[PDB]
Design an enzyme around this catalytic site. Structure first.
Site, PDB file in Angstrom:
ATOM      1  CG  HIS A  40      -1.897  -1.219   1.070  1.00 61.36           C
ATOM      2  ND1 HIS A  40      -3.195  -1.113   0.614  1.00 61.36           N
ATOM      3  CD2 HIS A  40      -1.679  -2.538   1.286  1.00 61.36           C
ATOM      4  CE1 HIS A  40      -3.746  -2.313   0.597  1.00 61.36           C
ATOM      5  NE2 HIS A  40      -2.848  -3.196   0.998  1.00 61.36           N
ATOM      6  CG  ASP A  78       0.190  -5.188   2.419  1.00 55.05           C
ATOM      7  OD1 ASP A  78       0.628  -4.535   1.451  1.00 55.05           O
ATOM      8  OD2 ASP A  78      -0.482  -4.651   3.334  1.00 55.05           O
ATOM      9  CB  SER A 158       0.251   1.640   6.787  1.00 52.14           C
ATOM     10  OG  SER A 158       0.671   1.065   5.577  1.00 52.14           O
TER      11      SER A 158
HETATM   12 ZN   LIG Z   1      -2.638   5.405   0.578  1.00 58.32          ZN
END
Ligand SMILES: [Zn+2]
Ligand SMILES: [Zn+2]
Ligand SMILES: [Zn+2]
Ligand SMILES: [Zn+2]
Length: 207
Positions: A40, A78, A158
């Protein structure tokens, strides 16, 4: 529902100096000129975009660095590796060299459910004027490459490392939508195939 989050006092010491900051996400140092984050984050940022080494708000940082290359894991997981231009755009306290301003994490040999873990990164970096936070908790499940943990995180975490009690990295915090309705969080668990992919992208010499 573990919520044990502390503002990091000094980001110039390990493990805090192994964490890097994107505009809205986190990553961490794994080797010479090399960081890990998730897919991401790697979708959002491009070659030539910049990271800041271990910022402690306005107290300073280990420098600002350009992303030289981006290598997404070819599997479904991911996780992305990025290589960093060794010469800083803006210097850290130890000079222009990326590697002298950070310390790389080592991989853990393994992890098991109920292990104590720590997530270090940059939750809500605009609201918390890029301060680094440590969030503490436990492993709830490990299934193949999925690591579920109970430790409080927020938007911005993240790409954060998930660390064991000895500050070795076990995985990387997801950048995707989490399991709906769950109070637990997800990370890519580092297994041999993923570790091999990462290790093959770590730099070793100068050109
Ligand atoms: Zn983003
Ligand atoms: Zn070097
Ligand atoms: Zn060079
Ligand atoms: Zn070479």
């Amino acid at each position: 529902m573990e919520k044990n989050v502390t503002q990091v006092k000094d980001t110039n010491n390990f493990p805090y100096n192994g964490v890097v900051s994107f505009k809205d996400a986190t990553g961490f140092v794994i080797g010479k000129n090399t960081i890990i984050t998730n897919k991401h984050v790697s979708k959002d940022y491009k070659v030539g975009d910049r990271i800041t080494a271990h910022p402690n708000g306005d107290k300073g940082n280990g420098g600002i660095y350009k992303i030289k290359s981006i290598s997404d894991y070819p599997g479904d997981e991911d996780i992305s590796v990025m290589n960093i231009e060794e010469q800083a755009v803006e210097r850290g306290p130890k000079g222009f060299n990326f590697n002298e301003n950070v310390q790389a994490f080592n991989f853990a040999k393994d992890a098991k459910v109920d292990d104590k873990i720590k997530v270090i990164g940059y939750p809500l970096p605009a609201q918390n004027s890029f301060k680094q936070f440590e969030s503490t908790g436990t492993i709830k499940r490990i299934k193949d490459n999925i690591l579920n943990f109970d430790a409080y995180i927020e938007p911005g975490n993240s790409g954060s490392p998930v660390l064991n009690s000895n500050n070795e990295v076990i995985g990387v915090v997801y950048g995707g939508i989490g399991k709906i309705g769950s109070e637990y969080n997800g990370a890519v668990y580092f297994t041999p195939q993923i570790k091999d992919f990462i290790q093959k992208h770590i730099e070793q010499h100068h050109h």
